[PDB]
Design a protein around this ligand. Structure first.
Ligand SMILES: [Cl-]
Length: 164
């Protein structure tokens, strides 16, 4: 297991524009197009992202290209953020994947708001962080996904993603 397989499990793959769990226009492997409620806005963003007149449909190769760029962007956002870098740097490789997952889903600013949970992660208080992380809009809105990520922070293993 690695970060790409993990997110592919959590986001799926759809080759036509769809709405994500919050109602926003999305494509591929969780690539957010726009928060605007206009489908025309979303098709404009898609065509700009891909570089061609797509008419709301992309290929599997195009989806995996956006995915590679989004994973790279999530990692670089972590390493540039002063609140996130020291936590990431303190973690083992499996738990680092959990941190990238959260940044991919909710963005760098959103994760840096989990101030208490980040401190507990840095101190390697795993059971305590896991409790604090579940006291969140994130957990109540997407509880199966949040459970898998939290389990990964708590155990440092991939057990939540095996079987799936
Ligand atoms: Cl969920």
């Amino acid at each position: 297991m690695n970060i790409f397989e993990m997110l592919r499990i959590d986001e799926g793959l759809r080759l036509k524009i769809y709405k994500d769990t919050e109602g926003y226009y999305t494509i591929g492997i969780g690539h957010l197009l726009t928060k605007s409620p206009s489908l025309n806005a979303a098709k404009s963003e898609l065509d700009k992202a891909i570089g061609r007149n797509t008419n709301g449909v992309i290929t599997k190769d195009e989806a995996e290209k956006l995915f590679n760029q989004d994973v790279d962007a999530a990692v670089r956002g972590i390493l540039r953020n002063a609140k996130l870098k020291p936590v990431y740097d303190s973690l083992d490789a499996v738990r680092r994947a959990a941190a990238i997952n959260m940044v991919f889903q909710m963005g760098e600013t959103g994760v840096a708001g989990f101030t208490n949970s980040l401190r507990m992660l840095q101190q390697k208080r795993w059971d305590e962080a896991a409790v604090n992380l579940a006291k969140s809009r994130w957990y109540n809105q997407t509880p199966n996904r949040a459970k898998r990520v939290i389990t990964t922070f708590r155990t440092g293993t991939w057990d939540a993603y095996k079987n799936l």
